[PDB]
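Forum: Protein Structure Q&A
Topic: Joint prediction for protein chains with partners

I've read a bunch of threads here and the consensus seems to be that you should model interacting components together rather than docking separate models afterwards. I'd like to see that in practice. Below is the full input, 678 residues plus whatever partners are listed. Could one of the regulars post the assembled result?
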Amino acid sequence: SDVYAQEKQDFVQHFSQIVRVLTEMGHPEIGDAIARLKEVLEYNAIGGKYNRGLTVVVAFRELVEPRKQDADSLQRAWTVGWCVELLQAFFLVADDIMDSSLTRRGQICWYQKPGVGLDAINDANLLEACIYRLLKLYCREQPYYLNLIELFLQSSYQTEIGQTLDLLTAPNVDLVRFTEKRYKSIVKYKTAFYSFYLPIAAAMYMAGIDGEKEHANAKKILLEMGEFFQIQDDYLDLFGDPSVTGKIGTDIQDNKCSWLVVQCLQRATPEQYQILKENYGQKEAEKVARVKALYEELDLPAVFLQYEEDSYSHIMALIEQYAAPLPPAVFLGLARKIY
Amino acid sequence: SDVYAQEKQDFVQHFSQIVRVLTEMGHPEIGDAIARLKEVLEYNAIGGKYNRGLTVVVAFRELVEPRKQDADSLQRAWTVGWCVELLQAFFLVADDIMDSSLTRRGQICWYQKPGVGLDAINDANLLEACIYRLLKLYCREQPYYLNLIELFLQSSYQTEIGQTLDLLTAPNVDLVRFTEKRYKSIVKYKTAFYSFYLPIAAAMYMAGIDGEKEHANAKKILLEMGEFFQIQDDYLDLFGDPSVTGKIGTDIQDNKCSWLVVQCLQRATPEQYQILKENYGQKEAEKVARVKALYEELDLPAVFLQYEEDSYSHIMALIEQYAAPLPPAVFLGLARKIY
Ligand SMILES: O=P(O)(O)C(Nc1ncnc2sc(-c3ccc([C@@H]4CC4(F)F)cc3)cc12)P(=O)(O)O
Ligand SMILES: O=P(O)(O)C(Nc1ncnc2sc(-c3ccc([C@@H]4CC4(F)F)cc3)cc12)P(=O)(O)O
Ligand SMILES: O=P(O)(O)C(Nc1ncnc2sc(-c3ccc([C@@H]4CC4(F)F)cc3)cc12)P(=O)(O)O
Ligand SMILES: O=P(O)(O)C(Nc1ncnc2sc(-c3ccc([C@@H]4CC4(F)F)cc3)cc12)P(=O)(O)O
Ligand SMILES: O=P(O)(O)C(Nc1ncnc2sc(-c3ccc([C@@H]4CC4(F)F)cc3)cc12)P(=O)(O)O
Ligand SMILES: O=P(O)(O)C(Nc1ncnc2sc(-c3ccc([C@@H]4CC4(F)F)cc3)cc12)P(=O)(O)O
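Posted by a regular:
Agreed with the consensus. Here's the joint model:
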């Protein structure tokens, strides 16, 4: 996206400084561990699309009078932006261990690299630690300092709670607990808060917008947005052309609590529920195709197509009603970019 | 200890409130995960001696004029005390995963309990999250609020760095990297900071003692103390009568970077180093006894006995020189209790 593609180069260049600062030796004793930290950051914070991190910068630009966007201010925006990317990094290193994943972004998951293993648990925590070190270094003197600390801490809590909810929901194959109230709730805590609310809110705080009604309004928009994109993500998992997407979907084999399956569960006859119990989770693809064919049989696409349309109207309506005092274009810019 | 045994009952009773607060449902959607959180706290924060947590309370009593030790103040001290215990809990859940431990306090490690597994990684992070939730709830309006947030965050960073250092130092059997500079450094980051500096410093902050020279002095004492007790702990591992201690030592089988082995390495002839390479790490006890007998051969006890004596004089000297403006008895009280 133009506004995101504009900001990107300078953002990703800043990562050099991030690492320099975080690894910079009045204490020689810890050199080796600091070396290890460099390895961990380089491997794990680098390679994504950086949509979350960039949203901090784009929003900051949109939210501050340009007279007050000096050298120092953007440094800070880049830093706070990278703080989000470290939070994501923390989450994914650990998620990959917990899920017993192999690949992450088409490359070997860190914990699987020869000689890392469960040491990766410590590594994940180091990534999280780095957030607060960066906040102290670049923002301790700023009025929004405490607000960001609390915002990040809270964002972690909410995600971990959501991860708990997901882990409870999807151990052992049981669809009885794959409700829509429960799906809506996993998505909200585990992805929407830190993926959609956090980056904008850090920018709002950075720009002196600290009021609770302001934040509540931003949140209301951003969470419903987050819900939409996860549902989209779940749709495209099975039906998206993977050359378009990037992912090759495995939510059926993985036994994940997908939007698709929740909907399928509200619609299936007792006969079909049995067919679902029969096929959801297996490696072998003859079973996997029996799930997709069931969904298709239930015209779940049309259900989705319907969901999208309703959702478009709801979202635009919320932005109308709740974006100001912020510019509509922070919301729209992000939507543009995540779609 | 009288001063610790005095404070204990009320402390441990407070844990009921901790849990009530941390699990208390305008959102019914997350009930199940909150339930899980209760299970995690109950299992993991309970059962230790609580020396770290209690040190916050004892020190608070020692450090505040009693006119200013109202109902509310102690609530807060209990809470901050429990924050330390949660930090320890976070560390140990994760350490046990990383070390592939079975038992912790003579009971099954959490991650080994049927149905937890690597979900424990999330659980560990929840324990850490709880620290900042408690700090917000009980101390957001207090002047020391930010100081404690930063103190806890920093304490986590230092420990994780130390854990990195330990993981690098003791993968694969190699004594070449078991130096004394390196031992002294692991102990400092991984145990001394959060076990000795953190609890006193939280109390200092709580009592309005925020100055850097004040804290630097406390730190100087408390780190050297921490070094002493870890070395003691390493000694008693092999030589302590385990009915006295509580632990049955396995630092030789576990291949840990013990004080004992570092010293043994500075003393061994090329002949004996070979005997050490020969026996350090094995399950079988004929090998394990060949290590103990080597240490004995090197009169490592007398070396230790010597270390203790020197260390006593050094510590008392530091307290003389650096305790005031604080009462000597916060240092001494703690020493009394950890020995
Ligand atoms: O296919 P994945 O990408 O692995 C997906 N997971 C997620 N997706 C988008 N955001 C988050 S945030 C998240 C997460 C958060 C916290 C943690 C653990 C607690 C911690 F941070 F240590 C682990 C994973 C997972 C997670 P799935 O597991 O639902 O299949
Ligand atoms: O490929 P597309 O042209 O994008 C088509 N998409 C749609 N088709 C019919 N109605 C809607 S409404 C819609 C939409 C809804 C919400 C949003 C984002 C959340 C928001 F409102 F911010 C963006 C686009 C897409 C959409 P397909 O992807 O289903 O093939
Ligand atoms: O024939 P098409 O136009 O390609 C049709 N698509 C749509 N139909 C009716 N409304 C919308 S709105 C929409 C859309 C809206 C927003 C966006 C991005 C977020 C934004 F507004 F910037 C992308 C696609 C597509 C879309 P289909 O392929 O589903 O048959
Ligand atoms: O015999 P153990 O008790 O397991 C001993 N370990 C420790 N001892 C006293 N304090 C700490 S603090 C600590 C630690 C800190 C951080 C972590 C990981 C980073 C995290 F918190 F996730 C794991 C363990 C271990 C640790 P050992 O592993 O040296 O044998
Ligand atoms: O059983 P014990 O009587 O305690 C005997 N202990 C000692 N023996 C000869 N010198 C010293 S000097 C000493 C000592 C040193 C430092 C400290 C703590 C660190 C401090 F200074 F705060 C406490 C006691 C113990 C100590 P043992 O345990 O070796 O059998
Ligand atoms: O014949 P013992 O007295 O039992 C002799 N022990 C000691 N010898 C010379 N200084 C100290 S100082 C000391 C000691 C000091 C402090 C403490 C706790 C920390 C305190 F000061 F409160 C415990 C023991 C023991 C101790 P041993 O058993 O090593 O032969």
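Chain B has one domain: 2-339.
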